[PDB]
């Protein structure tokens, strides 16, 4: 018997995605071929271990699939080693921390309120539970990272691992300087490029590979692949230690169907069209932030160098939670986000985060940003309304989905 | 541009699956509708948090999907609470350990050599790195667990957590006895039913829900669902604590496409046909074990109560490693497994584990077990040959995949 109830819900979700403007910076729309691989029979095989070194037999074809994903990842990012088995970005980070540190050691990452991710040292996350955390933020004036403040914190606290990269920082990272700082205290530099991995692949964002000891990432987000994790390094000796932490360290069997999807995603990222897409992603982000600033909205750091930006809603008397709800009411999805030196608690926040990778995949161009900017503005000032919801629907439907 | 290289490999793997006999106890073949859900657009949504309490907008449909999976899991197993977000079995156990123990605490599980799982205390696994481990095994004379030995160890080491459940134990578990032991020392009883979950759902195996404080499992294996984890309990308060460990504790965004697949698998398991399937799984295992005993092999414990059984190859002078290779050469996959107090090292062993869930899914019935037994025996005695490989191939092809 077919589970009609469940499939009816899947159809409702397709409709929602098609009829709205998805502006959550961490989302995107995978291609049909990525889905074809993820929904393949590769899920019926237990492949504990690594290619050529599996626990069980019958992995001759799976080994070629995994190997292909590994080599393409290496080729795509210019890395000497890769591990494509992490179930997620969080497991990728977990593995790296456990390979380089012992519980109790000191970890240094970006403060959550300044843009850091939960896995960069939050007390409610494994990172802040097993390790002593020291965070760095951004300057109160420019809202940019001050490298001398980072240097100071490193010398004072002597972290074993320093993490660069974030989930809500809209400017470029100076990886060379972060490596110099880590070298000053004998720490490992770990770059979590999950958010900008696609831009790095397209050559539109500095590559951390040569400067970081280890690089982690998600395969979804700007890389536009399936949901999963990835770990890279220019040092294969360090890589061997990390492989051991992924399995048998923290995971059991890998999701080989997902890994097949990663291989397809890397193949897609290697095509010239991916660079054109990535360029448009950034152009859309700059133009959209610009149009919102023209309407009186304050953009953190005054703009963006990547695919995302933050809007400070304090001057407008709106909390991030309220903005998110008013936009969601009309089909525009974003997520409330804390801003630097946010006076309000994380459950409420004073701003919203916006990203363009998803709408750019749907074919939106910089010339359409002024229109998107107008819908956001009205939803926030005039609030939800049927006429507004319809205008959003029509705009969305005029753009296809992969 | 289609990734022809990758898709050519997917076709080869399908051909491999069709033409061979999969006897690895942890394997199974999922239905078309389970793959359809896993390959759905639900992968495009970030949905951190839980139903009604997410960190992003646009989760209205996803909430109905996850709630559906939760409620079906509760009805299927007779539970008061459930968490369907774990990426795997390993993450389900990790979350439970971290919610119940602090690093340094003592964990008690079944010895890996006796049938326990990597996550039950192995030194190369996170369980053995973060916690002090005490292991229990089987008696050389009975080949079964000795509850008095378990009790003794418990009183002597005072573990914070006692894990029941294994990956290679062919008999029923006395959950009531285990809980009595746990109460006596003030420990939590955690049951990992990953392997036998499908049997529990079909009511063919004692249900651990009423006796354990927490129950973990995989959604694949005898439950025949997609690859992933699951947590259940009869205590909602404890459940709320475990929800926090899954997120924001150890994971980030859940795989909602996989959770949709879990919902479908639970739907399939709630149908009367699943009970007939599971009845056949157990009958095939008992019958195949009998047929092999009749042909000169010894069955550990003399038989089985579930879907798997251990073969002692000593009567025929073979090691598990050799048996594994000889079988693999003719398209029959099994895995080597130590027998109680194996005289051979662990990388060699004197036995093999055989499980019937996968062939049963393909339509094999008890009357055909004698034929599978003969093919296994001929491959081990005569060794691989083209003629034998063709006989396996034809038998396999005559039993379609889902």
Numbering used by the authors:
A (entry chain B): 1006 to 1407
B (entry chain A): 6 to 407
Copy the relevant paper text:
Serine hydroxymethyltransferase (SHMT), a ubiquitous PLP-dependent enzyme in the aminotransferase superfamily, catalyzes the reversible conversion of L-serine (L-Ser) to glycine (Gly), transferring a one-carbon unit to tetrahydrofolate (THF) to yield 5,10-methylenetetrahydrofolate (5,10-MTHF). As an enzyme in one-carbon metabolism, SHMT is essential to the synthesis of thymine nucleotides, purines, methionine, and other essential biomolecules. SHMT is found as a homodimer in prokaryotes, such as Thermus thermophilus (Tth), and a homotetramer in eukaryotes, such as humans. Like many metabolic enzymes, SHMT is evolutionarily highly conserved, especially in the active site, enabling us to utilize SHMT from Thermus thermophilus (TthSHMT) as a model of the mitochondrial human enzyme.
To track an amino acid substrate within the SHMT active site cavity, we obtained a second joint XN structure by soaking the same TthSHMT crystal with deuterated L-Ser (L-Ser-d7). This structure revealed L-Ser-d7 bound in a solvent-exposed peripheral substrate binding site at the entrance to the active site cavity in an apparent pre-Michaelis complex, with the sulfate anion continuing to block the L-Ser-d7 entry deeper into the active site cavity. Although it was expected that L-Ser-d7 would displace Lys226 in the Schiff base linkage to PLP to form the external aldimine, the intact internal aldimine was observed in this structure with the sulfate ions still occupying the substrate binding sites in both protomers. We, therefore, call this complex, TthSHMT/L-Ser, a pre-Michaelis complex, in which both protomers display the same open conformation observed in the substrate-free internal aldimine joint XN structure. In protomer A of TthSHMT/L-Ser, L-Ser-d7 is observed in the zwitterionic state with the protonated α-amino group facing a hydrophobic patch made up of Leu117 (Leu166 in hSHMT2), Leu123 (Leu172 in hSHMT2), and Phe252* (Phe320* in hSHMT2), whereas the deprotonated carboxyl group is directed into the bulk solvent. The side chain hydroxyl is positioned towards the substrate binding site next to the sulfate ion. The hydroxyl group of L-Ser-d7 donates its D atom in a weak bifurcated H-bond with a water molecule (2.20 Å), mediating its contact with Glu53*, and the sulfate ion (2.6 Å). The hydroxyl group of Tyr61* (Tyr106* in hSHMT2) rotates away from the sulfate ion to lose its H-bond as found in the substrate-free TthSHMT structure, and now makes a 2.2 Å H-bond with the L-Ser hydroxyl oxygen. It is important to note that in the TthSHMT/L-Ser joint XN structure, we found the same protonation states in the active sites of both protomers that were observed in the substrate-free structure. Thus, the non-covalent binding of the substrate in the pre-Michaelis complex does not disturb the locations of H atoms and hence the electrostatics of the active site cavity.
